[PDB]
Each structure stands twice: as structure tokens, then as C-alpha cells.
Amino acid sequence: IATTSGARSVGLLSVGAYRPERVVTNDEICQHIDSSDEWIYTRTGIKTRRFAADDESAASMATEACRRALSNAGLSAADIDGVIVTTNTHFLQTPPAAPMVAASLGAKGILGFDLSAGCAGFGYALGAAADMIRGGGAATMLVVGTEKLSPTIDMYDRGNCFIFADGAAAVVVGETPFQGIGPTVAGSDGEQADAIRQDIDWITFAQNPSGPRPFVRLEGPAVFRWAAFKMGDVGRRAMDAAGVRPDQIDVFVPHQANSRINELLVKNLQLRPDAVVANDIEHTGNTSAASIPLAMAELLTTGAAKPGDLALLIGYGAGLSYAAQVVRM
């Protein structure tokens, strides 16, 4: 059986982001909840979040982000060989969103599939995209994070009601002059699968329509407990596998899960004080799979981070799964 290969040096050629129009203030979700506006900010670091419209979906937003990621890479849908969509909010057990976003982009026949890790979907997808390109299975791909979580949020669960938002962001991954994506370091803890979860599976609900509705529930104390003592290490491994020292990373894009925890990680990771740190979480909240892509994109528009900058990506979330890697913006 033959063996093929592709460019051994791949890298992020661009980032396209799409953030819904509707801005949701805490007061807005603080109408049915008595969780003090200011408290949420100081606790999580969030001020506002974006919510998609009713006619939008994880998919529509996905294809839009790609349109932009495409334009920014100065590329055509004709240039993409495959697309990977990471999401946890495509409300169809089948068909997947990938082929639809593909046909929707014009590259209707290209290979593709949906990737579903926790909120750490992106890291896994970017890693797989690079793995497929080096294998000679594609040259240029799209990797998109999208989530329309608002519909899954219970306005009365004061512990997850202000954490999630909707949004999308894509990246174009292709051959590159010098490695622009380091080895993937990921993992999990399914023993704590319940940390972040949907409480009632759709089938149980369908055979009990009259009963309760399903909503995402988040056990912060545990998720953040795990993140605090686990992510710093996964972080060092990621840098260690990329061949870098904690002092060499210029931008740090951890999962926009909680500002305070991200800060703790900054110390533990031992990065330079002047290292730019994604804080997009402030006016976008937690977008699970789309978090990091949007975090990067936010850093670039402001110029806070510049193309070429050395970045450390660290995603963590539901099911209790994480994915981290070093890359160039």
C-alpha cells in the first residue's frame, strides 16, 4: 500500500471572525436573575456577550467566518481542499454542518466533517487540519469554530446564565515557509464529564415533551478547579514540544472561560509581563469552540498582537477536554 506526504510546514494563513449584532448586557440576563451586575464582572470578567438572531445558526455563522477568513488570506473557496467545523451547537443529529458550509461557500464538493471536543474543539481541529495537510491529504483547509449556545441557556440558572454566547471565527491553514503550528498537546478527564453538560438528552425529552426542557449546566467550582491545577502544565508541554521557552511567547490566547483563571495561568505559565493576553471574553463571553479563534481575531484587529507574533493557545472545557499548541499569528 502506497504512502503519501504533504507540506511538512503548515500554518495559520488568516483569521476570519463573525460576531452577532445583538449585544446582551448582564442587566439583560439579570432581569430574571438577582445576580448583581457588577459581581459577574469581577467574578468572571464578562461585561457583555453577543447573541445570534433566530434565523442564524451555528452553520450560517460558520460559513460567514470562512468568507472572511478567506478574504483575509486573500484566497478563494476554490483554494480550499477541506473544511473542519468544530461546534457543540448544531441542533441536528445529522447531517453535519461541514458539507453545508462547504456547498454554501462554493467549494460544494470538498471533503469535510464536524469536530466536537469540549470548548476545546478548535485546538483539536487545528491539530487535525495540520495533520491532514502534512499527510498529503489536503493542502489548504478551513477550520471553523461556531456556537449558538444562547438557545441552550436557562435564563434562571445563575451559574451558567452569564457564561455562554454565540459567535464564529475561522482560520485558513496551508503550506508555509516555516512551521507555523507546533505539535498538538491535548487530553481530558471524562471522570468529570458532568462539569459542563446538557442535563436531559434529546431523546428522553422527546418521549417526555410535557416534562422539562434541556439546558446546558456548568459546575464552575469544579471546571475552574481542574483548569487551575491542570492547564499551566499542558501549557508548558505545548511550549516544550514547540521547542520554546515561556519567555518567548508574545501572545497568550487561553480559553475565554474566566478572566481571573486566565490571569492565574499567566503567572503559572511564567510568561513575559509584556506578553499580550487575550481578554476578548469581556464583550463576547464564553463561546466554547469559537473562543480561541475569536480571541485571536480580536487581538489582531486592535493590533495588540501582530501577524508573526509567537502565540500559545490553550483551550479547555466541557466533557473535560483540552487542546493546546504554539503557533504564529
Add this chain to the structure above:
Amino acid sequence: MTEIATTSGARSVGLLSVGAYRPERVVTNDEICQHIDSSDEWIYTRTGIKTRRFAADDESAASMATEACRRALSNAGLSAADIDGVIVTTNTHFLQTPPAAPMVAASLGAKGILGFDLSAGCAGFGYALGAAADMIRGGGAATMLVVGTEKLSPTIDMYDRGNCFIFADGAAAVVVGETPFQGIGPTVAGSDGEQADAIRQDIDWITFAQNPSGPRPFVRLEGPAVFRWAAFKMGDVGRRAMDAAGVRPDQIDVFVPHQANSRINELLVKNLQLRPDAVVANDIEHTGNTSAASIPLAMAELLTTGAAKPGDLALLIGYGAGLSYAAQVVRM
């Protein structure tokens, strides 16, 4: 002046073993013909299905997957301590999150390993197999678990004379790892998102959740469209697999199309022109269409029945939902 390290390791990889798990309950054509006036015999004729398996109420895509992996793992004489990652392919994990992967991994005594859920419609296995193969060659892992699981029973409309007799539950998994010589050829895949509705869930969960009093969702299948698609175009992709694998049609010993429909596969066997003695997966007869777990299961059956021996050169062609396909040539 920054040098970001390149990683790699193990060019040669292959199927170390297969492990299947098919539910206990045998549902016959006559059973579903309790709510449908369709012709019994007509079912076996138009599809080639005699019976299918339905998992229990206390079973899930996740529970079946781990059972399969245990077997897949046993059969390779390995332990979770030997696996670096696991990929779960399915379309029937009724939870928007968490993914089934870490869960099933914990369930095997390897809670820390990497893993994710990948959905590519009925052809998720071929994609999942490719990814696992690409990750290993890339040094991101040395050995892996790829599991196909489907519990479609809960999604079938007993009164749908169009699909009611097609879908079924099950799970099969393979242990992917280093091998003496290439056991998994290059991955050929693609899709037709234009026919995204060919096979699908008629109503999304959020829309149903907002109107519980109204219509519950169900899987729907536009028979003709799928037939037309798969029956005439998978022969061409099968050729691409073999060509990419650097092999001749007359070299494949076992053909394993997605057990979607007899008539469709019988046409591909013809379009492919394989040695008359070439063995073809007919596992559909007593398991039906188990989507993502289809080809992996069909492999277990061929292997356990002796119809195919370890080492045979087989062509796998997955096709289905979203209208996506994934094929590759491997050694059993």
C-alpha cells in the same frame, strides 16, 4: 529567528484489530410491519435486510462504544495503557455536549487521553480512520482507538414506510497503531452539501424544544436521491482510493461498502470490476444500516465468519448523510 519544532513518527500504521458489539434485541421486518402496510418480502428485496438490532433503553452510543473498544482492545491483546487517543464517530449522541469521547475513554481506564467526537454522517468512520492515521504518522500519538457507534432506533419513525426498516443500532471499533508495513492507504473523501437534506433530522432540537406540543423530530431519507448519488458515484471514489493506495482493482480481496442498501452495493461491485472471487460485505442482512458504525461492523462479521482473513487487502467506502463519503484501502 524563532524555530517552532516539527514533530513526526511512524510512517507505517495499520489496523491492529477490530472489536464489534451488536445489541441483543432482534427486530424483524414483520415487527415494523406492525405499523406499516409495506410488503415484508419487499423489504428484504429492495434493501437486502432480514433483521436489525435495537439497543436497550438503558444503552447509548457511548455505552456501546466502550463495549466495542473493550473488545477491539482485548482482540489486539492491548490495554488502555497502550492507547494514546480515541476518536468516537457517531450521529446519535443525544447531548449537545459533553462529547462522548473522554467519557468512553474514562470508562476504559484512560480518562486522561486525548479524544473527540467526529461526525461526517454515515461516512464518519472513514474520516475518523484517516484522522487517526494522520495524527499517528505526525507523532501526535502512537496507538489509537477509532469507534463507530449508532443508536438510531430512538430516531426512527415507526410509520415512515420510507426509512422505518433501514436504520439500526450498533458499534464496532478498531485499534490503530504502528505496523510492519503500511496497512492504511491515503484517505479519499468529499461531499455534496447540495443534497444535505437527502438523509436528515426533519426538525432541529431547539425548534422542537420551543414547541414541545408540536411535531417531534425524526430521521428522514430521500431514497431515490441517495440511490442515484451512491449507486453511480461511489465506483469513481473507490477507484481513487485504490489509485492513491497504488493498487489494482484485481488486487482487492475484500470489498466493504457502507451497508446502506443491497442493490446499491451490488451495483458498485459491478462498477468496480473486482476479481470474481473478491468477497463483499453483506453484513447488512442482519444488522441493517448502522451509519457511522457500518463498515467497522461489516469488517467484524466478515472476519469472525472467516469470509475474510487477517491481512486481506480490502477497499472501504463509506457514504451517507450530509452527503459525504470517505474511502481508503486497508489490510484487515
